[PDB]
Design a protein around this nucleic acid. Structure first.
Ligand SMILES: Nc1ncnc2c1ncn2[C@@H]1O[C@H](CSCC[C@H](N)C(=O)O)[C@@H](O)[C@H]1O
Ligand SMILES: [Zn+2]
Ligand SMILES: [Zn+2]
Ligand SMILES: [Zn+2]
Ligand SMILES: [Zn+2]
Length: 467
DNA sequence: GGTACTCAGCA
DNA sequence: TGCTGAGTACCAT
């Protein structure tokens, strides 16, 4: 039960709940979401921990305070300092309680100084959560300050998490784990506002990844200009400047061979403008009585379902309709880069919230009887999609045994499952310049004694065999 | 058992 | 540049 994976699954559950709280129109669905993580005893580390957390590495990117609570990394949704209560005294007799374990520098306290390798961190108290957000009374050595003090005195390190601001439309604020720091020293003094503040000077420990500061182009756009956002391709692995789009034509829509059937068009729903009441929508009744997508960040798929029934050609609703999510244009600035032994593979340059549709696997719908590398069989196999010579960028996405994408079948133009639409959604929250991948799901010893293909996932859980 | 405290996150 | 938010952490006015 590998740590990074337990972490991944925890976060995915939190995201499920989150989205179901945003759909249910509740207030603070992040908070609500972690409340529902507590209801279900589904918080990865429920007791507190001095040091690193398995599966959470130096560099880890949390997308909200709520995530950090949902995993148990930082159990306060508000507090800068998370520490051990006196409830830990018999467990840790050798130390004196309370004891800081995780702090967050968000830039909310005026007397903070962030110099990266070293930090002068102001304790809590006398702060104004509203208004100017500034010190309004004197700080004492009474809580986080006391615990931080005890950290200094007993040589206990603290995890440090920084809040960063983003350009990425959908993500406004990210939180990065930058490692264990040590309280070098501490002292009381007046602050910028004239009120006594306590200051803690932490120095970053060693034996952890460095703290970095946050072309080889072969084609401007692998899309012909067809995509809403261009997809740039770069090789830096060679100056052998072949393009990914050689001998291949980019298409935005599906192509059907004459051998292949065109199913009867779905009847659709009659609501106008946008499907909101699910009483009145047939497309909602098709989905179990409740829409599968939520109206957040341009539509996010709540959770995987066998098939998803979208609004089709005949529905009275327009293209913005939240039940037409995977129909909309490319949200994300992507890139097709040359990998060292995966061939080409793709990655994002901006943040992809979990549940956002990345893209639909587009090619030529051929009959499975009629059939090298680039073929997606449709099971939800009578029919398949051959992206061999023509298709979109979906054919450049690699396999991983630890994917950040998953396969959802979507039905919109017809109600025939065999010709369902293969759409790939984000299973996790994805960060820029990191590789997008899904699981091909090949059963072993399938292709022919035998024959197999080595795997270059990089995943600690690689099976080492694609097939 | 009750409540003060708190470096978010909203439009 | 409003203002709610929920789960401690500690104590029982
Ligand atoms: N996890 C993986 N390990 C090794 N090779 C992979 C892989 N996933 C995909 N590939 C290679 O690439 C094919 C996927 S289609 C996209 C990759 C392709 N080489 C390209 O960049 O154009 C696979 O059939 C496989 O041969
Ligand atoms: Zn409708
Ligand atoms: Zn609709
Ligand atoms: Zn409809
Ligand atoms: Zn693998």
């Amino acid at each position: 039960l590998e740590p990074h994976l337990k972490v991944t699954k925890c976060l995915r559950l939190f995201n499920k709940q989150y989205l179901l709280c945003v759909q249910a129109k509740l207030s603070r669905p992040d908070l609500k979401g972690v409340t529902e993580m507590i209801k279900a005893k589904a918080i990865l580390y429920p007791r507190k921990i001095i040091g690193d957390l398995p599966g959470i590495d130096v560099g880890h990117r949390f997308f909200s305070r709520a995530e950090m609570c949902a995993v148990g990394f930082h159990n306060h949704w508000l507090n800068g300092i998370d520490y051990m209560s006196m409830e830990y005294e018999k467990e840790y007799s050798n130390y004196k309680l309370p004891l800081a374990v995780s702090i967050v520098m968000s830039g909310q306290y005026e007397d903070d100084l962030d110099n990266a390798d070293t930090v002068t961190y102001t304790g809590q108290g006398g702060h104004n959560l509203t208004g100017n957000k500034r010190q309004i009374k004197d700080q004492l050595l009474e809580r986080g300050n006391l615990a931080l003090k005890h950290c200094c005195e007993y040589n206990v390190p603290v995890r440090v998490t920084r809040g960063h601001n983003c350009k990425s439309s959908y993500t406004k604020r990210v939180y990065t784990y930058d490692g264990l720091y040590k309280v070098e020293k501490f002292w009381a003094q007046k602050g910028v506002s004239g009120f006594t503040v306590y200051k803690y000077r932490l120095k970053r420990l060693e034996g952890q990844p460095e703290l970095t500061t946050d072309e080889g182009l072969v084609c401007e756009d692998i899309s012909g200009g067809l995509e809403f956002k261009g997809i740039p391709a770069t090789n830096r692995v060679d100056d052998s400047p072949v393009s990914p789009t050689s001998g291949f034509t980019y298409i935005k829509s599906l192509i059907i061979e004459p051998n292949v059937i065109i199913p009867k068009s779905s009847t659709g729903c009659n609501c106008r403008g946008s499907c909101t009441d699910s009483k009145k929508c047939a497309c909602a009744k098709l989905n179990g009585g409740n829409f599968p997508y939520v109206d957040l960040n341009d539509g996010r798929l709540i959770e995987s379902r066998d098939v998803v029934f979208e609004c089709g050609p005949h529905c009275g609703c327009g293209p913005k309709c939240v039940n037409r999510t995977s129909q909309k244009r490319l949200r994300f600035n992507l890139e097709v880069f040359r990998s060292a032994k995966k061939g080409w593979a793709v990655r994002s340059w901006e943040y992809i919230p979990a549940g956002s549709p990345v893209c639909e696997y587009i090619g030529v719908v051929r009959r499975t009887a009629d059939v090298n590398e680039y073929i997606f069989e449709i099971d939800c196999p009578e029919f398949c999609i051959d992206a061999g010579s023509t298709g979109n960028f979906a054919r450049f996405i690699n396999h991983s045994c630890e994917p950040n994408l998953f396969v959802q079948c979507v039905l919109s133009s017809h109600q025939d499952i065999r010709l369902a639409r293969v759409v790939l959604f984000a299973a996790d929250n994805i960060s820029p310049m990191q590789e997008l991948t899904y699981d091909y799901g090949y059963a072993l010893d399938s292709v022919h004694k035998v024959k197999q293909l080595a795997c270059y996932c990089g995943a600690l859980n690689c099976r080492k065999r694609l097939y």
